[PDB]
Design a protein around this motif. Structure first.
Motif, short mmCIF file in Angstrom:
data_model
loop_
_atom_site.label_atom_id
_atom_site.label_comp_id
_atom_site.label_asym_id
_atom_site.label_seq_id
_atom_site.Cartn_x
_atom_site.Cartn_y
_atom_site.Cartn_z
N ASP A 31 2.59 -27.46 17.35
CA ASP A 31 2.08 -26.26 16.70
C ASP A 31 3.19 -25.24 16.48
O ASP A 31 3.16 -24.51 15.48
N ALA A 32 4.19 -25.22 17.35
CA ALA A 32 5.29 -24.28 17.14
C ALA A 32 6.14 -24.72 15.95
O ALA A 32 6.55 -23.90 15.13
N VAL A 33 6.31 -26.03 15.79
CA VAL A 33 7.05 -26.55 14.65
C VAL A 33 6.22 -26.40 13.39
O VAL A 33 6.76 -26.21 12.29
N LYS A 92 14.04 -22.50 10.19
CA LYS A 92 14.56 -23.63 10.93
C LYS A 92 14.77 -23.31 12.40
O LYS A 92 15.21 -24.18 13.16
N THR A 93 14.46 -22.09 12.83
CA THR A 93 14.60 -21.66 14.21
C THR A 93 13.24 -21.34 14.80
O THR A 93 12.56 -20.41 14.33
N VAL A 94 12.83 -22.10 15.81
CA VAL A 94 11.55 -21.90 16.47
C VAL A 94 11.67 -20.64 17.32
O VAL A 94 12.30 -20.65 18.38
N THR A 95 11.07 -19.54 16.86
CA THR A 95 11.17 -18.30 17.61
C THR A 95 10.19 -18.32 18.78
O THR A 95 9.45 -19.28 18.99
N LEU A 136 14.64 -31.62 27.22
CA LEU A 136 13.32 -32.21 27.04
C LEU A 136 12.63 -31.65 25.81
O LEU A 136 12.02 -32.39 25.04
N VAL A 137 12.75 -30.33 25.59
CA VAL A 137 12.11 -29.75 24.41
C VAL A 137 12.82 -30.23 23.15
O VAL A 137 12.18 -30.49 22.13
N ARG A 138 14.15 -30.36 23.20
CA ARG A 138 14.88 -30.76 22.00
C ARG A 138 14.83 -32.26 21.77
O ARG A 138 15.30 -32.72 20.72
N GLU A 139 14.28 -33.04 22.70
CA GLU A 139 14.02 -34.44 22.45
C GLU A 139 12.55 -34.72 22.17
O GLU A 139 12.22 -35.79 21.64
N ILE A 140 11.66 -33.79 22.51
CA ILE A 140 10.27 -33.89 22.07
C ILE A 140 10.10 -33.37 20.65
O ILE A 140 9.42 -33.98 19.83
N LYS A 186 10.25 -32.51 13.52
CA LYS A 186 11.16 -32.18 12.43
C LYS A 186 12.58 -32.34 12.95
O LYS A 186 12.94 -31.76 13.97
N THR A 187 13.38 -33.13 12.24
CA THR A 187 14.73 -33.39 12.70
C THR A 187 15.61 -32.18 12.45
O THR A 187 15.34 -31.37 11.56
N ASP A 188 16.63 -32.02 13.30
CA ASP A 188 17.63 -30.95 13.19
C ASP A 188 16.94 -29.58 13.19
O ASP A 188 17.02 -28.82 12.23
N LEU A 189 16.27 -29.29 14.30
CA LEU A 189 15.75 -27.95 14.53
C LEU A 189 16.62 -27.18 15.50
O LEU A 189 17.36 -27.74 16.32
N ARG A 190 16.53 -25.86 15.39
CA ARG A 190 17.16 -24.92 16.30
C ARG A 190 16.09 -24.12 17.03
O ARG A 190 15.02 -23.85 16.48
N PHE A 191 16.37 -23.76 18.27
CA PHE A 191 15.44 -23.00 19.08
C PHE A 191 16.09 -21.69 19.49
O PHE A 191 17.29 -21.65 19.79
N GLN A 192 15.31 -20.61 19.50
CA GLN A 192 15.81 -19.37 20.07
C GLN A 192 15.98 -19.53 21.57
O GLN A 192 15.37 -20.40 22.20
N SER A 193 16.81 -18.67 22.16
CA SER A 193 17.02 -18.77 23.59
C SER A 193 15.80 -18.30 24.37
O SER A 193 15.66 -18.65 25.54
#
Lengths: 90, 76, 74, 88, 88, 90, 74, 76
Positions: free
Chosen positions: B44-46, B55-58, C11-15, C20-27
DNA sequence: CCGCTCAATTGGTCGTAGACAGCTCTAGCACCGCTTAAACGCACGTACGCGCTGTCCCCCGCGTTTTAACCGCCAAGGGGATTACTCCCTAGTCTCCAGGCAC
DNA sequence: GTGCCTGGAGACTAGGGAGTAATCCCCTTGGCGGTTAAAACGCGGGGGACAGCGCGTACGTGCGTTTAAGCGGTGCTAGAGCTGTCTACGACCAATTGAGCGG
């Protein structure tokens, strides 16, 4: 000012303006934001009344998120409102 | 991998949960519960990020994904 | 927190890679997910310990997690 | 947004006790959540009756629906004794 | 309201099998519920992005959010292969 | 007609008219109702496809609410959508 | 239905009296409440039977309803 | 009274739930669970009726009260 | 089997709401060193699942025998739903005035 | 300490949306009376909680080791907000058809 006229601490005009930017209806009422600001004022003055009661039931000066997390999941007065909440503490 | 959720981190979560003694098979079941929970929330976050053309999951996409499970998160 | 942060980020970046491939996550998104996952697991082991006491035991077993998740609706 | 009024009510309820900076964001997300929940419940109640104006009566009903028990009785009593003090 | 079209789709999916009168009210409450759920999710998604127009993209996201898994993949594929057949 | 043009069985104009009387936004879109009528059409043609598949073995002529209650809580295809539903059967 | 209709209507009309006096109910509101209450009680005894099997028993006991309601969040 | 929820009606609900044998104290606990469930749903149905300026609790007020608990009811 | 009526369709308007082109500039990702804390591999020594085993007690099946649920009648009125106004409340100025800012 | 600027509460006008009657009239409640199923009582017995008793394991603890996570520090560039135009926009009217019904 309608906030002093209603004898509240929250701004009625900001609650009305937030009801306008949410577009929750087509037209609001006259006294609907005064009622909503008095209920949210009551809930804040009931949660922070207990956070300020629990900080002095201790030696702390400010109010930390650990005090909010300890109060709102205890204190059956408002623990029903926070069954599914999580204070982040980060 | 899921193996980063180590044995003593699950043991610390069970000690905070109030568990006194842990069997030797809880460790792989708890990783399988955590992976299902993350596969339900990260989906759901994606979805909120792809809907917001980002492209950045806030952190507000994570708060909205937890809100869609009855797990409201305060502080973000 | 009780889980180490870097293996939880792996774990979050492999789930999320399956979605969607090539995602970025905020800290702070990873810390919100880690805060929510430990607040999920402690609340799960609090009902697993109830299901283990209910059988007159102390050791929790995988059938206690399975009962606490089937009653909850998972 | 609502953080300037949380400290203003805290000066009334506890003029000696201060508040942190993360706890202000927690109380501000709490206020924006119970606001967007009460207003959402009052918009569904304005749709179920096919009205167009959210009056104070749809707010009193959304408070009766959302808050359980004594919190609903005190929030309705505070909203009523604030609208009556407003009209006078 | 939507009961006249449930029988019209049933004539396509099963032209030999009929339907009862209580089951038509059940399918009509099912349709008015998944309608007022998808449209409500798409209005919250139009508010979270501060838009004003519900496009088909907020419907595709509310379908991805509401329906779990393969039902979301087939409802998105049917909505996409109905909008493309519509524009042509 | 946009329903035949989109090759659907539900009326697009009624879904658009129900989006207008719900006031879900300020302005809809071109494909705001063709997409929604094709998704609700897919869900109806997926539930009634299974009710008509299950009646075949059953031998019944019409479709009763007992068939809907038996199908939607079995049939893991759409049983996730009905975790919290109850067909009344009265 | 499994509960008799007239005692269930007396139960609804003696519970609702505490909320607003002198109310009237439609004939289908009471059947919606009775349908929802048996669909609640069967779904409750399906988790009570799981909590009774979990203790290696067959007889359900009030601690099984109390566990199935504490895990569920009631 | 709550005593109208008799012993064999709770036994029929448990037999439909799949319970083989019932203790002698389930009967007063099940009435205490049913009374809490009705006190939670009828409160919301009476709230919708008082909001609709009616005196007759219709079946759609009951459907809305069950919808506010995640118990959607089809057929009304 | 045809004549007549009607909400679905489909031309211009003006979109401004969203698309989009470009700008920056967080910041999130990427990499290396590196303490050292945290995990990790055995030993073992239990505490403790776990089967079984016997008193035993209490719940289910089984007549009994009640009881009121239910069904069927009618009688009454009441409060729903609809309509018809209808009146009055809220949608847009201003303005007059507070409250934030300089010296 | 008070000049000087920003915004929001009182007049001030157009309203359509609740208020308020007012009207069938539906239905809901309220009874009475009568079968008759369902529950209620008691009995009995044997099924199953159940507490005790061993008794064989697998977990916590510890005691070593040993791996990587944080951390701290650079690069770097990506795409998240922007801002600033820049165009399709759904909204409206309007002008045609297919379904429902009459003959």
């Amino acid at each position: 000012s309608r906030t002093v006229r209603a004898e509240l601490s929250f701004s009625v005009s900001q609650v009305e303006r937030s009801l306008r930017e949410g577009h929750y209806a087509q037209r609001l009422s006259r006294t609907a934001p005064v009622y909503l600001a008095a209920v949210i004022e009551y809930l804040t003055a009931k949660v922070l009344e207990l956070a300020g009661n629990e900080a002095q039931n201790s030696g702390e000066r400010n109010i930390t998120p650990l005090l909010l997390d300890m109060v709102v999941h205890n204190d059956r007065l408002l623990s029903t409102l926070f069954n599914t909440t999580t204070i982040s503490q980060v | 991998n899921i193996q980063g959720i180590t044995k003593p981190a699950i043991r610390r979560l069970a000690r905070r949960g109030g568990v006194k003694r842990i069997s030797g098979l809880i460790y792989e079941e708890t990783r399988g519960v955590l992976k299902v929970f993350l596969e339900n929330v990260i989906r759901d976050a994606v979805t909120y990020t792809e809907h917001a053309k980002r492209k950045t999951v806030t952190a507000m996409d994570v708060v909205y994904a937890l809100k869609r499970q009855g797990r409201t998160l305060y502080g973000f | 927190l009780l889980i180490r942060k870097l293996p939880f980020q792996r774990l979050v970046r492999e789930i999320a890679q399956d979605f969607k491939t090539d995602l970025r996550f905020q800290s702070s998104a990873v810390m919100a997910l880690q805060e929510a996952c430990e607040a999920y697991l402690v609340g799960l082991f609090e009902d697993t310990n109830l299901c283990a006491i209910h059988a007159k035991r102390v050791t929790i077993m995988p059938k206690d997690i399975q009962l606490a998740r089937r009653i909850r609706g998972e | 947004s609502y953080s300037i009024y949380v400290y203003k009510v805290l000066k009334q309820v506890h003029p000696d006790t201060g508040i942190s900076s993360k706890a202000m964001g927690i109380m501000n997300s709490f206020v924006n959540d119970i606001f967007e929940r009460i207003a959402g419940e009052a918009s569904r109640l304005a749709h179920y009756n096919k009205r167009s104006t959210i009056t104070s009566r749809e707010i009193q009903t959304a408070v009766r629906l959302l808050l359980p028990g004594e919190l609903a009785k005190h929030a309705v009593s505070e909203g009523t004794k604030a609208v009556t003090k407003y009209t006078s």
